[PDB]
Specification:
part of a larger assembly; 3 chains; A: about 55 residues; mainly alpha; about 0% strand; rod-shaped; C: about 375 residues; alpha+beta; Nucleotidyltransferase, domain 5; Actin, Chain A, domain 2; 4 domains; six-stranded mixed sheet; five-stranded mixed sheet; 14 helices; about 35% helix; flat; binds adenosine-5'-diphosphate; ATP binding (chain C)
Chain lengths: ~55, ~15, ~375
């Protein structure tokens, strides 16, 4: 009987622990995209294949 | 003379 | 990140939100109680740019945003924006999860009921906080100031509450509440500066005027003599630098705005002013209470940082008070930062562990529990 009470309690707690992990994963995914947008902010001005045809032609 | 917590509570219990 | 499930303390007003954890001396971060939104059409693509901005983000990007305050005169009218402010407060700058910490919020004693009820619901439903308490601003100020007896005159951005407390108990019949606040003084300063050739009517302009007010304005000890000189000579003008390089100087307007606290008629308000209401909060209490409240006028809230205000408040009430008796003002460098400080103290008291509402009782009662358990 104690084990039934224990398994019932552990899954209630387990749900909350899994939810907490999920919340931190979600924050990483969101933070990661903000960083990627900031990366594009500074990399963008040079993302070209440049100054080749200028002499070839 | 005339709640967001109820939803989470249910998820963990179900 | 803490070694204990210390309560989080968030002093959420109509101005700035001060937040940190219980047991500390100061908030970890402060935030404008603002959610900002663009008033322009985007032209460039791949610029990031949010639909809405929160707190300091909203203020930093304000050049093209209209800025709204979810709290007006001490009450939350927009709780979706407060959920955003609290998300930011807790997860971006304090970087804590209320789910593992009790949370203490603050309000005036006659703040309409929806405020404490919605504050309770947001923290229990969106943050799933294990416990809640909504505290009295006067109580918090009294703990911060080292007193159990006195008048708490809290003249901040939202409302002036002005509640007399004796031996830690309310004397509610003597609350000389007044719908006159720092936000009205800001509005008055925008208008009086408009008269000097510097119009202030947009959001960016309003934030600038609030900054001007905080650095340049004062109430002084004697209005008529201060104006006799300020209205006659440039020697009392003070300059301010605006973000675009403009320079504004303010003369008698520098104190005529703030003076509205003593002369409310300046903005069309029908009121005796904050010093008469302070006096009446003492006078309306029993005669064996009055002596202790006269000796303990407790200053807190915003506007308490105007030059001449502590000296003036004691002068104005001692002038109405009877002779022989000594009347005194308490106005520590902890003025206005007393509500947050009190939150830290109160949250941490062992006797207060019987006041916290848990996320147990909450589910059976709902957010209305705040009216059964807090005050
Ligand atoms: N030097 C100052 N001059 C004029 N007003 C001030 C000054 N410092 C603070 N105040 C005003 O205090 C108000 C904030 O009230 P406050 O009680 O501190 O809210 P809270 O309890 O949430 O911290 C703002 O309108 C601010 O402009």
């Amino acid at each position: 009987r104690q084990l039934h009470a224990r398994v019932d309690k552990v899954d209630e707690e387990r749900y909350d622990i899994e939810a907490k992990v999920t919340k931190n994963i979600t924050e990483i995914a969101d933070l990661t995209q903000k960083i990627f947008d900031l990366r594009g902010k500074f990399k963008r001005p040079t993302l070209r294949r440049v100054r080749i045809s200028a002499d070839a032609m | 003379q005339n709640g967001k917590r109820q939803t989470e509570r249910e998820k963990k219990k179900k | 990140d803490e070694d204990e499930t210390t309560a989080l303390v968030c002093d959420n007003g109509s101005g700035l939100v001060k937040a940190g954890f219980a047991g500390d001396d100061a908030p970890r971060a402060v935030f404008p109680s603002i959610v900002g939104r663009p008033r322009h059409q985007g032209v460039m693509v791949g610029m990031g740019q949010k639909d809405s901005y929160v707190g300091d983000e909203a203020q930093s990007k304000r050049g093209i945003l209209t800025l709204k305050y979810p709290i007006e005169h001490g009450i939350i009218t927009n709780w979706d924006d407060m959920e955003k402010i609290w998300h930011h407060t807790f997860y971006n700058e304090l970087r804590v999860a209320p789910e593992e910490h009790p949370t203490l919020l603050t309000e005036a004693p006659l703040n309409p009921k929806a405020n404490r009820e919605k504050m309770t619901q947001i923290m229990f439903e969106t943050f799933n906080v294990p416990a809640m308490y909504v505290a009295i601003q006067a109580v918090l100020s009294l703990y911060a100031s080292g007193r159990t007896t006195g008048i708490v005159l809290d003249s901040g951005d939202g409302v002036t509450h002005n509640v007399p407390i004796y031996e830690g108990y309310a004397l509610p019949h003597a609350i000389m509440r007044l719908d006159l606040a720092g936000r009205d003084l800001t509005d008055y300063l925008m208008k009086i500066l408009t008269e000097r050739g510097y119009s202030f009517v947009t959001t960016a302009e309003r934030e600038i005027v609030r900054d001007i007010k905080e650095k340049l304005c004062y109430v002084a000890l004697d209005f008529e003599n201060e104006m006799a000189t300020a209205a006659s000579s440039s020697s009392l003008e003070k300059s301010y630098e605006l973000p675009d390089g403009q320079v504004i100087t303010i003369g008698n307007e520098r104190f005529r705005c703030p003076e509205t606290l003593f002369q409310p008629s300046f903005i069309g308000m029908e009121s005796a002013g904050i010093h008469e209401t302070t006096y009446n909060s003492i006078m309306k209490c029993d005669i064996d209470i009055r002596k202790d409240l006269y000796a303990n006028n407790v200053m807190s809230g915003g506007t308490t940082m105007y030059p001449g205000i502590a000296d003036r408040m004691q002068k104005e009430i001692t002038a109405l008070a009877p002779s022989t008796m000594k009347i005194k003002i308490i106005a520590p460098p902890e003025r206005k930062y007393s509500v947050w400080i009190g939150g830290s103290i109160l949250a941490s008291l062992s006797t207060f562990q019987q006041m916290w509402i848990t996320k147990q009782e909450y589910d059976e009662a709902g957010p209305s529990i705040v009216h059964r358990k807090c005050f």
